[PDB]
Design a protein around this ligand. Structure first.
Ligand SMILES: O[C@@H]1[C@@H](O)[C@H](O[C@@H]2CO[C@@H](O[C@@H]3CO[C@@H](O)[C@H](O)[C@H]3O)[C@H](O)[C@H]2O)OC[C@H]1O
Length: 393
């Protein structure tokens, strides 16, 4: 795997692109999304400063809010690209406005998943994929830049958050939504990430939240007492993808049960289909395979997904039933980007076409540019061999 060797595959180079052009493409993407036109191109916004210095947020234009997903993706992209100033401003904003520090609040230790741009929470509860990316990006920051102090003690912050993700007790208390009860973010017996710690829907998961690539990092650098738990979560997620992904298409549902079956949320029953969340599953298993080489099922799963999308040439939707019936929409940059990341594990040379498809894209503009753009930039980094495991001491 790439971590053992230190050699990350540059998939664009493998399909013939020059280093200079690959650098241009990444730099273009970053400049557009972080510094492009404020009304049409950017997702990064400077938001003044406080005692920790500059503040900035990643704007979910798609839904007119700031999400923990976006903030955590922003931190991952910026640490991968060695953009410490931007990283620190985003983290300051998350730690200042999103982080719940009150021990009598049910979200204690976590980050409010949906915020307004002025720092006011829409929902105090967390979205655990946010936390997963925050922790990992923080460990990567510690590896690349070393640890500062206070909120900038990246490794100490990571350790604390990750420990709490496992060990948080049940808390009932007031929130912006009324009294709520929430638990830990990983199920202790299943060793799987939850869809929500809200006790009302706590015993479910989401295949796109399974990040064995990252759990391997935690298994090496977390607080010693939790390392076996994270190693277990990595094994469990690999098995999870084998059960959750449809056997013909390798499409996964947005939401799931611990046993691998789709879960229909009462407020969103179409969560049993392959939609916006599930686009990311292939990236998660493919990254894991590329880095660690342990998911023996990943190459066949990536080949199946790409074979399926080849059948959709010229009529690609972006919403599907798990057996491959189109459920609406046209092609999106986000899905193109995610499908390209399947090339981190695929063996069939049709992968060349998916990587080439991502190469041909431009950065996104307009109202839906956030979800498209953050996936695009992450996919560009993966496919360029520039998204690495930065493992701290
Ligand atoms: O009370 C619980 C709610 O707080 C909970 O809200 C969900 C929290 O996560 C949201 O998902 C994020 C945004 O959409 C995806 O693309 C991201 O990957 C996630 O970070 C989800 O949409 C909210 O419904 O819902 C359940 C309640 O019990």
């Amino acid at each position: 795997g790439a971590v053992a060797t230190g050699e990350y595959r540059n998939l664009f180079a493998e399909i013939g692109k020059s280093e200079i052009d690959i650098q241009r493409k990444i730099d273009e993407a970053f400049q557009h999304l972080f510094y492009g036109d404020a009304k049409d191109a950017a997702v990064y916004y400077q938001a003044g400063g406080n005692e920790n210095g500059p503040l900035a947020y990643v704007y979910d234009v798609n839904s007119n809010d700031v999400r923990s997903e976006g903030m955590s993706y922003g931190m991952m992209i910026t640490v991968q690209m060695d953009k410490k100033a931007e990283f620190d401003a985003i983290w300051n904003w998350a730690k200042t406005y999103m982080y719940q520090d009150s021990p009598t609040h049910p979200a204690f230790g976590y980050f409010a998943w949906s915020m307004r741009r002025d720092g006011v929470a829409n929902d105090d509860m967390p979205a655990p994929d946010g936390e997963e990316y925050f922790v990992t990006a923080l460990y990567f920051a510690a590896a690349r830049w070393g640890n500062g102090e206070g909120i900038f003690n990246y490794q100490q912050e990571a350790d604390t958050i990750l420990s709490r993700m496992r060990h948080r007790q049940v808390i009932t208390g007031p929130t912006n939504r009324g009294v709520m009860t929430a638990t830990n973010l990983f199920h202790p017996e299943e060793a799987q990430v939850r869809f929500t710690p809200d006790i009302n829907n706590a015993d479910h998961t989401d295949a796109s939240y399974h990040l064995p690539s990252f759990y391997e990092i935690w298994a090496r650098v977390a607080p010693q007492e939790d390392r076996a738990f994270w190693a277990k979560a990595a094994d469990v997620s690999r098995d999870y993808f084998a059960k959750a992904a449809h056997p013909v298409t390798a499409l996964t549902p947005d939401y799931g049960n611990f046993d691998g079956t789709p879960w229909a949320a009462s407020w969103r029953p179409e969560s049993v289909d392959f939609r916006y969340d599930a686009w990311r599953s292939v990236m998660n298993w493919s990254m894991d395979y590329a880095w660690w080489g342990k998911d023996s099922g990943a190459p066949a799963r990536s080949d199946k997904l790409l074979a399926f999308f080849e059948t959709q040439e010229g009529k690609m939707n972006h919403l599907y039933s798990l057996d491959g019936k189109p459920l609406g929409g046209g092609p999106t940059l986000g899905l193109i980007s995610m499908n390209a990341t399947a090339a981190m594990a695929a063996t069939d040379p049709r992968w060349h076409n998916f990587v080439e498809k991502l190469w041909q894209q431009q950065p996104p503009t307009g109202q839906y540019r956030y979800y498209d753009g953050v996936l695009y930039l992450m996919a560009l980094l993966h496919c360029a061999g520039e998204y690495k495991a930065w493992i701290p001491d």
